[PDB]
Amino acid sequence: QSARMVAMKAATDNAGQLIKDLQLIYNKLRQAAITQEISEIVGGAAAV
Amino acid sequence: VQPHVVTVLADTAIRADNLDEAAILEARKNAEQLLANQKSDLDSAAALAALAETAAQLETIRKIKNRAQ
What we know:
This is part of a larger assembly, with chains A (48 residues) and B (69 residues).
Chain A: H1 2-45
Chain B: H1 22-54, H2 58-65
């Protein structure tokens, strides 16, 4: 029982650290995508 | 037996009147095995499923970080 609690606590810790990882990933990827379509728009508007 | 104290170290000591508690010992064994079944299910069904699930596509995301686009 004790060792199961320890292992599950460790699983919780791993999940939390990965969670932080995923927020950072989402933030950067969203920024990059947004900037990308902005670039497309500004390129397009320059045409006509 | 002692002049004041008696201890009864019985193998299977059961509060009963007749040698017919077979109807309740089996009930005890079924309770134990059922709770063992609960252990085996909830350990497996919850974790082992979630164990596989949480490890689905991590590297798929890890590689698409360095995408500058």
